[PDB]
């Protein structure tokens, strides 16, 4: 018996559709560790039952065919439970890494989801480790090229930029930009992509 596991797996499918329709990593939903621990306790029951049945099989009063068929059935049940759990976990890890790869590996809690409370503690420490790896990777031979930069090919040099949020003044190379609220800039493309990804600039 492992039908309950399907209830988990089916749910995961919906989350993928959430990724599919949006086409943007955002608002990962709350976990389902309750059903997971339900499956864990039932599989502990299955394991103890299998151990007991092996005990009586070794005891001599248990039929060999009954013992073997019970063993195979229980083993298949454990196999399906494990498959369901890892099927959930792999997708969760994949979407977590996809989210972590594009935000420069800083987790950006100041400005995706706000609380990140919808993630398990193990998932959060995994996210921290992946951010560590992301920071480490660009610190080696590829220091001159930012791996977490844009992916749109550079098509034009001068674009119009309209302010979205207010700040003070920000220095650049050979100049300084004052982020007055709701103004327009005629600046170089390769200077403001960092701000645009941060959400402080609009109207590319």
């Amino acid at each position: 018996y492992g039908d309950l596991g399907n209830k988990l797996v089916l749910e995961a499918k919906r989350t993928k559709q959430l990724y599919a329709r949006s086409n943007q990593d955002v608002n990962l939903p709350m976990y389902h560790e309750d059903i997971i621990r339900n499956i864990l306790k039932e599989v502990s029951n299955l394991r103890k039952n299998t151990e007991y049945l092996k005990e009586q099989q070794q005891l001599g009063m248990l039929d060999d065919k009954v013992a073997k068929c019970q063993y195979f059935v229980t083993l298949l049940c454990m196999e399906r439970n494990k498959r369901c759990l890892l099927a959930y976990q792999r997708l969760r890890t994949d979407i977590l890494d996809s989210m972590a790869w594009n935000n420069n590996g800083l987790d950006l809690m100041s400005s995706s989801q706000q609380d990140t409370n919808n993630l398990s503690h193990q998932e959060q420490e995994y996210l921290k480790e992946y951010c560590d790896l992301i920071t480490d990777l660009k610190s080696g031979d590829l220091v001159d090229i930012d791996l977490s930069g844009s992916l749109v090919p550079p098509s034009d040099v001068f674009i119009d930029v309209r302010v979205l949020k207010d700040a003070g003044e920000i220095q650049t190379e050979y100049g300084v930009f004052n982020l007055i609220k709701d103004s327009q800039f005629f600046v170089r493309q390769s200077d403001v992509e960092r701000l645009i990804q941060q959400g402080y600039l609009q109207k590319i």
């Binding site: 599919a20 996809s98 594009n102 992916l151 749109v152 098509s155």
Partner: protein, 190 residues
């Protein structure tokens, strides 16, 4: 990169980039022939033409440099032999008279057309609307031929001798997945 399976095909922006990475002829307005000044000394283009240019003489530069100079007043792009009515006419006649072979046309079909129409609106000898309509006619005819040819899809291979870039790009996923499923069925049957 993955970003929702963007790791399997090309986005139209990448196609436009890989097309503008191509050489073209130019008709410069200014002169920078060396005093007999700053060296161009690029890393992915022969700077000799850039350094050795003089006004009102034809020379070859990569496309995006020509576009940048056209954003300024130092450029005059020379259109290819396609972009004229009397060549497109014989081309459409060739498609009409041969209902099975796609006409000979390069990979950069319709992309150079879009870019030149968007930027170099004024340097043409022909009205823009006529050329746009004829290009639209070519697009429709080739689309019809593609639909006609797609009817049969062997599980072994196929030949598409004269498809341009965008036409292949748009059709890649559907065709690939259909033949993958057919191959899976056939192999599973054996």
């Amino acid at each position: 990169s993955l970003p929702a399976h963007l790791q399997q095909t090309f986005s139209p922006e990448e196609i436009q980039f890989i097309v503008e990475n191509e050489p073209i002829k130019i008709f410069p307005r200014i002169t920078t022939r060396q005093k007999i000044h700053t060296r161009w000394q690029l890393i992915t283009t022969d700077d000799k033409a850039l350094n050795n240019m003089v006004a009102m003489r034809s020379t070859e530069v990569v496309l995006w440099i020509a576009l940048l100079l056209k954003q300024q007043s130092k450029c005059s792009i020379v259109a290819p032999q396609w972009l004229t009515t009397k060549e497109l006419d014989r081309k459409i006649q060739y498609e009409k008279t041969h209902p099975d072979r796609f006409s000979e046309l390069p990979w950069n079909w319709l992309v150079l057309a879009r870019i030149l129409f968007n930027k170099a609106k004024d340097d043409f000898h022909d009205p823009i609307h006529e050329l746009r309509g004829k290009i639209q006619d070519l697009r429709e005819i080739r689309q019809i031929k593609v639909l006609k040819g797609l009817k049969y899809l062997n599980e072994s291979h196929l030949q598409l001798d004269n498809l341009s870039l965008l036409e292949i790009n748009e059709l890649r996923p559907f065709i690939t997945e259909i033949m993958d499923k057919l191959r899976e069925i056939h192999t599973a049957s054996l």
